[PDB]
Symmetry: D3
Subunit: 339 residues, 6 copies
């Protein structure tokens, strides 16, 4: 078996405009000062330009070396934002424009083609940095029709997954030639939001060997789904791990849908590590038992706790849950049995 690497931290929730949350160098020193050994880097042109990194290996060698001076390593790159723009339903076109470059706002086809190019540059930059996995979202074409009311016409869902496979298969081929695994995070508001849809997406891509899963148990808790049985079924396809807590406390007034309430008042909400319902002892045990060769990446989000306390407690929490791992005599065996 294998000892899970960590602790690491996802910087997306901590970027800002002042120090030390403004540059990658400063975020690396901040993370290393708290006890983390790795970082998951979002590909924002301010922090990490994918186009320069995909063009010159030298650009990547500078980033890698300068982070290693502080004691930090890049675990994976993140294209959650760009992956979302690969497939967008028109009802959400304007809500997502704030995630695209300003010059592309109001131009949906140009925004989609820019996102596909970003994903392909992410494969090449990952090879330069020596990374084995990459984190992303899948986008959503059919999410407005998640509940069968009004009744979904015949062929609607099948067309959505055929189109989704047609758009991601070229990108998946690019990750093959660079030897990088593509890990989708199953998340509400995506067509890939549970295990059934991931199996359906696989068949639409010809069972591509680079289509894998980023495991985050919090989203399964928020929809009352067994996150531990998920590991038992899909362990062969799990290549990345988000450590994130959540709780679901249904009342007589609201359930999973949430009633348009804010995060503080929803029955299902995210919590700081240790303050939710996730059995992280069981999660780390199963990942250790199924030979998971990856990083335990903290993705922090809480409805109550101050952000600087959550980032500090996460490092100790992860390090306490990581587990350090440790002839045939036919004739005799024949005698022991009836043979």
């Amino acid at each position: 078996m294998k000892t899970i690497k960590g602790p690491a931290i996802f910087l997306a929730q901590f970027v800002g405009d002042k120090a030390p949350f403004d540059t990658l160098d400063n975020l690396g020193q901040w993370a290393a000062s708290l006890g983390y050994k790795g970082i998951q880097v979002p590909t924002d042109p301010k922090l990490f330009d994918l186009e320069k990194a995909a063009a010159s290996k030298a650009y990547c060698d500078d980033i890698k070396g300068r982070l290693a001076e502080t004691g930090i390593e890049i675990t994976e790159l993140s294209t959650h934002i760009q992956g979302q723009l690969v497939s967008v339903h028109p009802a959400y076109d304007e809500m997502f424009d704030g995630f695209a470059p300003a010059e592309l706002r109001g131009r949906p086809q140009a925004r989609q083609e820019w996102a596909v190019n970003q994903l392909k540059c992410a494969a090449k930059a990952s090879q330069h940095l020596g990374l084995k996995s990459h984190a992303s979202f899948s986008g959503a074409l059919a999410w407005p029709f998640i509940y069968p009311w009004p009744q979904r016409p015949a062929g609607l869902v099948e067309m959505a997954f055929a189109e989704l496979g047609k758009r991601w298969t070229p990108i998946l081929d690019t990750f093959e030639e660079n030897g990088v695994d593509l890990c989708y995070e199953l998340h509400p508001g995506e067509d890939l939001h549970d295990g059934i849809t991931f199996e359906r997406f696989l068949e639409a891509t010809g069972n591509h060997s680079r289509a894998n899963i980023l495991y985050d148990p919090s989203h399964f808790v928020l929809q009352a789904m067994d996150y531990l049985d998920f590991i038992d079924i899909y362990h062969e396809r799990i290549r990345a791990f988000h450590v994130k807590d959540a709780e679901f406390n249904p009342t007589g007034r609201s359930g999973v849908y949430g009633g348009y309430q804010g995060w503080v008042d929803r029955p299902g909400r995210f919590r700081s590590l240790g303050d939710g319902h996730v059995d992280f002892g069981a999660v780390f045990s199963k990942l250790t038992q199924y030979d998971f060769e990856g990083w335990a990446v903290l993705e922090w989000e809480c409805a109550l706790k101050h952000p600087e306390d959550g980032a500090r407690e996460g490092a100790g929490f992860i390090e306490n849950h990581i587990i350090r791992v440790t002839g045939t005599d036919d004739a005799a065996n024949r005698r022991l049995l009836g043979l």
Copy 2:
């Protein structure tokens, strides 16, 4: 203090092409042969024309007299379809067009105005028939944004409920003029899908006394919501009752969202009476103790059982769960409490 009336049956799920599921005349005879004493009638021009009924009391008196000869009475009228069209998000324009008259398809503003007029004529026809309650849907403007991804802009939800109240307050005033309660069914794909949103809608209408609830526990089971505490909280506003069973069996592959699966394979699905998880013994007990003065109406749906068997077993099921209900001395009281 009140014995729940019943058993009754909602005819929406049983209309067909040939006898006895084609006319209101035959459906009443069919319901009476199975043991039912009342019917909930959908307002489809083939079965019940609201315009003719709101204009001529004789039309209403004629239908009532014919049904009473077989031994059946109208419990309530249904405008689920028309109530839905009062508020439609553009993403669903074509999916709902099959529910409007053919000449209104493709004309969103004309369809919405036809729906408001249908609702007002139903309030007058309900007085003509001597009915106390009326069942309907609320429509949905914000359902595509039920999950906060992408993040909801400030004021989006509050504008949706302000608009929803603006459209229903004129209709609610018409129901007040006729002395009829309007009962919304909390349902996925509606802005009113749990108790929290109903409370928000009530405030947006100024606590209008005609805004009430049609209680159907099956939809609460499908979103992992406590359907028994719901009765304890909102019993003062519950004026109608749907008897409908359902089950929720989460797996390691899917949860409440369902993964675009059909009804047979979804973790949460409807089942025939007695084959689900709803504790109907407790449901009838709570309604009986809170003095529910209405009808127990069967709304049948199952992924497995044949509809002829479901309708037959329903009548006996409801009858077994209905419950038949049954100065001051001071001087002594002062001695017992030692003054």
Copy 3:
């Protein structure tokens, strides 16, 4: 979907020396009077001669015709006894001698070969009777070593299952020629006692298409195993069904092993239908949904109830749980998905 056939009854627990429990005809009239429409017949020479049935088509046609006069048909044949003798560990040699003919006692190799011939004759007799399935046990070579104390030497388990496949593959080849499925009952005291061991046996037979499962949930309840999840995993290999109830009530004095206690005092014990813990509503629902084309066969056993009352109630219990089963406008679909 398919409607489960039944109710049927397994005669093994009711055969005796006095009427109406002495002959196959008397048992057939007794079963038909109680409401059963099928019977599972153990292959006891007193009841059914495998050697005569495998040799003459007339013998089988004779039995079938007489049973059809009473209204009963043979569901499957049973070789639980003979199947057990295909693999016996020396520690149990004498305890099993009462199940073989008297002349074969004391001779383990001749007894084992007599059992192989019995299994092969059952495949021929099943074709003559027009049967599609056959029920049996697997035998046990490694059951004394079910708990790893003393520690099992390397290769012991792999050799036991290699021998089982070596002995059953010739028999399974005979069942392929006659077109009959062989259904093993997962049972304690057999090497095939749960789902993991069945998968191991399958690979030892070259993934043979005739190796299938007889599903009996009671044995899973007695060892605290999720009998409903078993159906979701193995439904493609389930071809027979035993309806049998059981309960498991652990105390501070005893658990699954039972402490050599009798059936009345064991924490886990069999109970008459309806008096145990098995959720038969869920069992029949899952079997109906996965297109099970078999019989619901009652195998009765209880620690308290009189056997005559148990036989009388089984037919009604099983009958209440059986469930009677019931273009694409691309252009529109592309507009709905904004393509």
Copy 4:
């Protein structure tokens, strides 16, 4: 009430060939460096010679005195291996030979007699060392017939327990002479594997006052038995305590029997302290309230964790769960009851 003594550790799972896991002296210093105050010693002739210890008081005082210099005390002696060999069914004769001295392998009668003598020497050696309890197994004659299929002939189970009591009664009488309690660990693969069988064995020995229980909740979890109710029923016969964690997670493929799977894949498996299902807070509370005068001895076993990490964490775990313990006016009572 009594404060449970500890933390202590059972050395059986840690003996090896490299230092400090080779000799009793090295194991005692290793345990003391990790924070333990006691050790449970397996009586293997290469680790602790029972025949020499039953003959010479000086030998025991040497071992005891040397260990006290390190800061360690012997909690009890262990004859799990030898106790198993007092009663062995022929189906397991060869599988158990690896636990007997080389000269006894293949000679079932000589092996059983050597084991009976080992148990009797353990009583004297415990008296010399000033120990009150002794840990052992009972052996098994009827374990292959634990499930009634094929059906057990009449008198089979009764004969097995009659022979078991007949073999242990002489040994138990020797433990009475030395004033030492004999604590059986209820364990699968023994005839004594739960509370019902222990009560049956107690009667077959004439309710012998020296037959007691070593409480280990992990074995009860793996067979889905209520380990907390066990303490409420048998607390008066509980004289030793193993702290050991375990979990039972049934699936749709396997249950308690386990399907011949290894420990990593079994539904019910042992886990390091704190990583299982045992409510140790409740266990220590019940033992404290029932006046348990013993040691909390760690018996470590895990399917995943490295043995060096498990031994290091156990001492702190045990320390956090130990609980430190702290004329009637008749006329007035008559007035209150009027």
Copy 5:
């Protein structure tokens, strides 16, 4: 084992002043018309005079013969009312005065001495009727001090139980002479309200062989006590059985104490058979397995249902839960064990 006799019915909750609820003769016919075969008779002078029954066997012979002509038998006599008055705390003196004859109201010691004499006459009258058990209450001296606030002085509890033994031992000696078991019903408002207090009472009476228990699971449910484990511990002292249902649904507003609420609103309340939480299948199985030689007597009480429907349904409920019950070869055994 023994088959539990029944169904029987306790007449205390149904006696009134109008026919057929006024005389024992009319009540016996009413019970027989509903399907009951036995009755538990309260010892109220209007229905059954103890002074006349304890003095003349002929009076007892008259009632037995008159009841046997309708098809009904007396199961046991009840002195619940009188047994309470054997021990009363002064705070409740006036509240219980309504159950004694008017001439004793005011004199506590005369009322208590009247109750002791009533109990002794019930012992002789039960022997005359051929009854082997007798139902009663124990009274309470320390019930106002059930919660240790204010703290209890030393010796208070021990004195109360010393007084109970002092008062009941003479009565228990009288039941020994007549050969009748005295069955206390563990009930709130009594000193004997659970198993711990019954054992303490047994200690204060010298382990008197006539002190036994009337088992009623509803009172254990109302205080969140394991009623099934109770049978396993005390089955050797259980001689009578009340079939009575109850439920306990704690909220965020109230618990076991109940907040002085009425029976309709209490979290713990009594319910008609089948409408509560009691697992009667488990209760009847355990009583059958421990050889209970008594009657299943219905004691009816519900917060909602009409008393006539409950009495009609009780007989069928009891009928479906009653369970109808059904050398050594040393040498061979020595070979199987290996000597």
Copy 6:
């Protein structure tokens, strides 16, 4: 939202005769040495004289001054003893006399009015010390009648609650004039023992704005009541917080009532922090979310643990559970909703 202040400690369980448990100065040094930042002081004459404090602000300023030199502040005052004596049923007259000054023993009416004076003087002293909250008990008139056996006569409960308000309303008006909240601790042996009784008392005082709740989850656990839903309902009236653990383990011998057993053997008993069943993570989260501006005060009690070890561990336990807290584009919103 606001961060809960703490850790603090209630000194009532720790006062003694020798140092440091004899004087308030010594108790403050002992409490501060263990890590506590606040203290709850019982109003015992030997420690804090209400008369001198209600008359002289300087006396109060001394206690504030000298305690601040140690690092400790007075959180609130406690008049649990005096509050109990405001309403006493005669059955407890002698048991409670030990809490009044020696001259008041046997003087009931003087004991009651002495307590009213203590309560009113406590408001002044709280006004002087700058405190916002005050802890007390309510007393009990009807606690002997908590179970309706014997049946409660009409008007008994209503008169008891009418008298409670008549006695407390003058005291509550005094707390109004000083600006201090009066927090009742819902406790067994009081008329205010759950949420339902608190609502009844509130209605009897004219919804007095100064009548509030001291939240202690241990007492709800001991009567099997949902302590987390209590917070959701009454959070507006919760002004004080006791950190106290407890467990409830029902057996087959005893339940909630306890059978007059001692604390070590009762099914429901108090335990040291962390050794009970209270989910304190959820409690602190709910109090943080509902804007609780108060103190987390440890009230220690355990059946097993030594009092020193409990006081030392309590401070660290509370610290780990305290949570440190942190235009509208109508046109865009109108486009997202379609209209």
